[PDB]
Design a protein around this ligand. Structure first.
Ligand code: CHL
Ligand code: CHL
Ligand code: CLA
Ligand code: CLA
Ligand code: CLA
Ligand code: CLA
Ligand code: LUT
Ligand code: LUT
Ligand code: LUT
Ligand code: RRX
Ligand code: BCR
Ligand code: LMT
Lengths: 214, 93, 194, 165, 61, 194
């Protein structure tokens, strides 16, 4: 089985089953089966959220830097949209919290009790759809085009593609924040500046990554 | 009129009436359970400690519902402190 | 029951199924003790009835056009006269306080004295003149308890909005409909910290 | 602002405290030749002082008439008025390391418990296994909670010896 | 009679340094000895003793 | 069945073959539960009948030439007058709202008060004055649902044209007829990106 590091000792609770099980639990965090299950759902949610966010920071930018759109920088769009829409931060956030809270509540209870949201009579007409299939995979209303119903090996491929792309997107978001935090420019700007003089424009030569006093 | 009589009389009357027909039964019921059940009997015996022992004049009132003199001096006392808190409050404050 | 507070949850066994309004909501398990459950059940209906009357009165005094729920005991301080539907009532806070005391001192003691634990919350009889209970009472009880939980919450809303928004319930509503996103608990100053 | 505490940048006493403190070192520099190690040293103390007595004000440290910077503890006051770097933020920093040290310690204790003679691995510490558990305490908060929500952080009350009442 | 030799039993004696704690049954005198179950403990009392004869009722496997 | 949503598929099996309007189109599988099956069926027909009435009113008023559907609910904002078929009506916003609520409440309640379920979808009797439900009812229902589904889609079209084009549905129709290759959803500037 592919491992995060060749020769690394596979833990024990990480038996090839979860999508992306490369045997990486150095600090034995997922030792508890319940903890591992919650962490698995947490990972999927983190990856999916990051993938749908880095796509909203890179894609819109690459097209702005190609003249197609005019979207502002991810670290400036917030203010631009606030002054554009006119909605006050407070009201905008509060509404979002309530809507996100309700959807999170349903998913949360579905974990606490698997396939429980499909209670007879709960969500008017739809409870059935709110059943769920496996931990972080609410098949049905989600995955409408039925791509995870083709075979039992297209599921295991499409699921390794979600996790590897997610893990990458999650690290990409951390990078974008750190890049702007140190460089003070957009991600594309950083990449372009690096490709210009690759051997003279790195995190070392930024002034913030390593405060070299000596 | 509106002299001390109006305030004192009203307070006394209301408290006595409310304690003679409204809280009187609750008052009796609370007295029983408190002194007979959870609380037992005091002044077992011996010594001139009969002072702590219940009197008798208090338990001698033909008044229906057994409104004893202590009850009349109880609700009435509560009433004479409302008549004098209402008049006094209007005096200043 | 009547539903589930959290579609998916279960249990609240300490809360019986017959209890009028059992949606299962007892997270802090305040109804486990049977005795406490009895008192809490009776108090809820008592609170609902009072809450429903209050909410109606708070909006009525404003809807008909005679003032607001807050600025009503103002006459007793400003130095004016009582005014029901405009008609000046000939009384003073002192005589009203006394009338209330004796009135509540008798009715409330009478209800509390009654020991049936089923007719202390649902007396019926003179309290049910049109005899609407006949034919089915559970649904009406659910509507009474459900409409009341709406009123108890509303009555809190009027006080809270007056405390922060500083506006009458009807007026505050118009403010929201006016600029919804710009006239909420958030754009107020007291509700949210930031 | 806050409790009559003027900002050190606007604190005159803070400025005097600088003037008089650098003068007290510029009088000890005179009794020494310009190049002597004694003098190179006193000039570093004057530079270091002039940097600190400015890093503090630039950090918006409110100080009283004494001219000595004061700290705000209330989270609301510290956060609302940008005084989080003092006490507030430092608080969590210690808590994280504190729990890290404690969690790593219990991890080792509970591993040597059972292992042969657990009492001889407390005196002659197993430096290898002690070095394999230090980094495990990095995510201690995640693991500690997972133990509360699993009933494994504490012991059953019927397995802890208690003194006769 | 008594817990099997070698069996670990939770001490139930209130004034025992090893109360609520477990120990291995070294032996159980099958006579009418008041306290017959000899129980050994890795921990030692304040005196330094690491064992004690507990009655059958003072032990719970 | 009335056909197939995707000719060559077969996935829908929970849907009964006799269900009026059964084209076998359930991509998210919402009709599996029989209770949800009945509810969705009743909701669909209701939505269809309303949409059919709305579409007739939205364009009808324009045909006769008394204004567009969007301009209807504006007089009350400007404090103007209501006018049906040109003839004026003496009402106002709050009174209209109140009269509507009560009427809709007493009517919709009774419809839901029904238990046969089939009647909830097709009551007939007083709702069948011409009694055209004597025969060919099974196929006339398909016409009712097919026209109804089209009506609901058409209603969305009116809103979308007004949202992007802004012009009235009849006007927008003429614009496309006059300049088909020039005027279209593709050139509205809202349908396509940015
Ligand atoms: C993962 C979520 C998330 C992230 C990473 C960011 C990140 C950012 N948002 Mg933000 N936001 C996010 C969610 C949300 N924002 C907003 C609404 C806004 C607005 C209205 C604005 C931002 C702005 C910003 C930027 C400046 C932050 C700021 O105001 O600090 C101010 C604090 C400092 C400058 C002090 C130093 C802070 C540093 C971290 C240390 C920043 C890069 C601002 C922007 O556009 O940047 C110009 C801005 O004006 N966001 C909403 C709606 C409620 C969000 C979620 O619901
Ligand atoms: C009477 C109290 C009552 C309470 C406290 C709750 C609480 C909740 N219900 Mg609920 N319900 C209650 C009554 C009832 N519910 C339902 C029917 C439902 C359904 C159908 C669902 C819920 C759900 C939920 C959860 C939604 C999470 C959310 O939106 O958070 C977001 C956070 C906020 C909106 C912020 C709250 C602000 C706070 C109150 C004030 C400011 C601080 C939530 C914890 C959802 C859930 O998770 O179910 C599993 C859901 O799907 N309820 C019925 C009718 C049967 C009720 C009848 O009384
Ligand atoms: C919040 C995001 C997140 C979460 C919840 C998880 C959760 C999990 N990962 Mg994972 N991972 C992530 C991000 C995440 N990962 C990213 C971004 C990468 C790219 C490097 C990876 C790469 C990766 C590999 C190669 C493997 C895992 C594996 C696992 C599982 C092992 C059990 C475990 O360690 O418990 C969960 C861990 C935690 C709850 C700790 C939280 C993270 C700490 C607090 C942050 C500390 C800094 C961190 C290292 C980097 C961020 C800065 C587990 C369910 C193993 C597996 O698949 O087994 C089935 C495994 O082989 N992950
Ligand atoms: C450790 C104990 C402790 C103590 C003794 C205090 C004491 C105080 N806090 Mg506080 N606070 C604490 C913990 C504590 N806090 C913690 C753990 C948090 C994190 C949740 C906060 C977050 C917090 C905020 C956000 C605020 C305070 C504020 C205050 C002051 C007035 C607020 C109040 O009435 O009660 C205490 C209030 C709380 C404990 C939290 C609720 C937030 C308060 C109620 C909002 C009040 C806003 C208003 C401006 C306060 C008026 C103060 C007055 C001098 C004008 C007060 C001296 C206010 C302040 O002075 O900052 C400007 C305020 O805004 N605190
Ligand atoms: C794994 C080591 C460890 C851990 C996790 C704890 C944890 C705890 N101790 Mg404790 N303690 C320790 C060692 C430890 N102690 C040692 C060695 C001594 C002898 C000096 C004490 C003496 C002591 C006293 C007198 C008290 C506590 C108390 C407490 C509790 C209060 C929390 C606190 O602030 O800590 C407090 C910690 C101290 C006061 C001193 C210990 C600090 C040392 C430096 C930490 C131990 C590091 C350890 C050597 C690392 C081993 C790693 C391994 C690989 C070798 C807490 C649960 C209090 C309590 O009982 O609360 C009710 C209390 O009264 N401890
Ligand atoms: C009975 C269905 C129906 C019919 C006959 C029409 C007819 C017409 N529409 Mg329209 N539309 C419809 C549904 C319909 N629409 C729906 C459901 C939507 C919401 C997606 C729209 C959104 C829409 C917009 C935004 C615009 C039109 C416009 C137009 C006019 C120009 C042609 C065009 O570009 O249409 C395009 C319509 C679509 C691509 C939607 C396809 C929906 C069909 C019914 C599903 C199959 C034309 C007379 C344009 C106009 O107003 O005139 C200038 C215009 O800009 N439509
Ligand atoms: C469910 C459903 C249903 C049915 O089935 C069908 C369908 C519809 C299909 C489905 C859907 C799905 C989805 C949504 C998906 C998504 C995806 C994504 C977005 C990904 C991302 C993903 C993303 C990612 C990876 C990211 C990446 C990024 C990166 C690397 C970055 C890098 C960088 C850094 C750091 C910084 C600098 O300065 C710059 C650079 C150098 C540039
Ligand atoms: C369930 C649960 C379970 C778990 O365990 C815990 C928890 C969660 C905590 C719980 C909860 C609870 C709750 C919610 C409660 C509520 C309460 C209320 C709010 C009441 C009201 C209440 C309210 C009410 C009565 C109201 C009242 C009122 C009245 C009388 C009257 C008034 C008025 C009016 C007419 C007007 C004028 O101008 C003035 C006046 C004269 C003044
Ligand atoms: C089958 C399936 C299967 C899978 O699984 C899932 C899914 C996909 C979800 C499903 C689907 C569904 C759907 C399609 C739905 C649709 C709906 C609609 C559109 C409705 C409308 C609806 C619509 C409607 C009712 C309409 C209404 C209207 C009305 C009343 C009226 C109006 C009007 C007129 C006369 C005129 C004037 O001047 C104004 C007004 C007064 C304003
Ligand atoms: C916001 C904050 C402060 C506010 C404090 C306030 C208002 C309340 C504080 C309550 C506090 C600090 C503590 C309450 C603790 C109660 C309990 C039951 C927690 C016990 C913690 C336990 C048992 C954990 C022990 C650990 C385990 C098991 C493993 C390792 O993690 C190590 C260890 C020993 C930590 C202020 C003082 C202003 C200041 C600014 C930071
Ligand atoms: C017989 C009879 C009856 C009755 C009558 C009467 C008239 C009663 C009353 C009685 C009374 C009449 C009671 C009262 C009591 C009271 C008391 C005994 C006390 C008083 C006083 C006080 C309590 C005061 C105190 C104080 C002072 C000293 C000073 C200042 C402060 C104060 C005010 C606090 C009738 C007719 C119905 C009928 C039948 C028969
Ligand atoms: C703005 C006004 C705000 C409210 C003012 C009044 C506050 C509420 C009344 C406080 C005094 C209550 O006084 C008394 O309370 C007890 C306690 O339940 C009631 O007691 C009643 O219920 C208890 C419940 O256990 C029974 O045991 C008792 O037999 C019965 O009489 C009395 O009927 C009531 O007369």
């Amino acid at each position: 089985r592919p491992l995060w590091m060749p020769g690394a000792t596979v833990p024990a609770h990480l038996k090839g089953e979860l999508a992306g099980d490369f045997g990486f639990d150095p600090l034995n965090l997922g030792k508890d089966p319940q903890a591992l299950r919650w962490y698995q759902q947490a990972e999927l949610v983190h990856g999916r959220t990051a993938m749908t966010a880095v796509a909203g920071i890179l894609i819109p930018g690459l097209l702005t830097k190609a003249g197609v759109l005019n979207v502002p920088e991810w670290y400036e769009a917030g203010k631009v949209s606030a002054e554009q829409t006119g909605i006050a931060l407070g009201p905008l956030l509060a509404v979002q919290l309530f809507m996100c809270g309700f959807v999170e509540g349903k998913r949360w209870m579905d974990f606490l009790k698997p396939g429980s949201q499909s209670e007879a009579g709960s969500f008017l007409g739809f409870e059935a759809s709110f059943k769920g299939t496996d931990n972080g995979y609410p098949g049905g209303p989600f995955d409408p085009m039925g791509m995870c119903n083709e075979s039992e090996a297209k599921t295991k491929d499409l699921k390794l593609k979600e996790i590897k792309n997610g893990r990458l997107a999650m690290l990409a978001c951390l990078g974008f924040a750190a890049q702007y935090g140190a460089t003070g420019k957009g991600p594309l700007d950083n990449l372009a500046d690096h490709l210009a003089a690759p051997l003279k424009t790195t995190f070392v030569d930024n002034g913030i990554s390593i405060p070299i006093h000596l | 009129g509106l002299e001390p009589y109006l305030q004192v009389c009203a307070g006394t009357a209301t408290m006595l009436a409310v304690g003679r027909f409204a809280f009187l039964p609750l008052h009796r019921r609370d007295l029983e359970r408190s002194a007979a059940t959870a609380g037992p009997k005091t002044t077992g015996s011996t010594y001139f400690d009969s002072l702590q022992q219940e009197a008798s004049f208090i338990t001698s009132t033909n008044d229906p519902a057994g409104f004893t003199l202590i009850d009349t001096m109880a609700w009435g006392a509560l009433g004479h402190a409302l008549g004098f808190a209402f008049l006094a409050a209007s005096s200043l404050q | 029951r009547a539903g589930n507070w959290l579609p998916g949850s279960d249990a609240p066994a300490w809360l019986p199924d017959d209890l009028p309004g059992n949606y299962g909501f007892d997270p802090l398990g305040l109804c486990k003790d049977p005795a406490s459950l009895k008192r809490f059940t009776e108090s809820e209906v008592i609170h609902c009835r009072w809450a429903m009357l209050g909410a109606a009165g708070c909006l009525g005094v404003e809807a008909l056009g005679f003032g607001n729920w807050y600025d009503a005991p103002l006459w007793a301080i400003n130095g004016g006269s009582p005014t029901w539907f405009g008609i000046s009532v000939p009384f003073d806070l002192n005589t009203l306080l006394a009338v209330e005391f004796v009135a509540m001192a008798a009715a409330e003691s009478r209800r509390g004295d009654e020991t049936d634990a089923a007719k202390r919350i649902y007396p019926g009889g003179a309290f049910d003149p049109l005899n609407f209970a006949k034919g089915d009472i559970e649904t009406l009880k659910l509507k009474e308890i459900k409409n009341g939980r709406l009123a108890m919450m509303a009555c809190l809303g009027f006080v809270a909005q007056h405390a922060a928004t500083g506006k009458t319930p009807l007026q505050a509503l118009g403010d929201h409909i006016g600029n919804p996103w710009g006239s909420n608990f958030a754009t107020n100053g007291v509700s949210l910290p930031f | 602002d806050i409790a009559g505490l003027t900002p050190c940048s606007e604190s005159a006493a803070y400025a005097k405290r600088l003037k008089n403190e650098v003068k007290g070192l510029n009088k000890r520099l005179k009794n020494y030749e310009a190049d002597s190690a004694p003098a190179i040293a006193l000039k570093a103390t004057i530079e270091r002082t002039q940097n600190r007595f400015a890093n503090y004000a630039k950090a918006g440290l409110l100080c009283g008439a004494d001219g000595l910077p004061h700290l705000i503890s209330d989270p609301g006051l510290a956060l609302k008025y940008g005084h989080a770097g003092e006490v507030f933020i430092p608080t969590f920093g210690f808590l994280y390391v504190a729990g890290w040290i404690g969690y790593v310690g219990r991890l080792y204790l509970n591993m040597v418990k059972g292992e042969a003679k657990p009492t001889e691995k407390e005196i002659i510490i197993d430096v290898p296994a002690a070095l394999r558990l230090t980094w495990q305490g990095a995510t201690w908060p995640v693991q500690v909670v997972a133990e509360l929500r699993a009933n494994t952080l504490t012991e059953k009350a019927e397995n802890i010896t208690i003194s006769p009442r | 009679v008594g817990p099997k030799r070698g069996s670990q039993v939770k001490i139930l004696r209130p004034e025992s340094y090893w109360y609520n704690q477990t120990g291995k049954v070294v032996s159980v005198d099958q006579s009418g000895i008041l306290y017959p179950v000899v129980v050994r403990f890795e921990t030692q009392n304040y005196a330094g003793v690491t064992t004690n004869n507990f009655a059958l009722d003072e032990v719970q496997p």
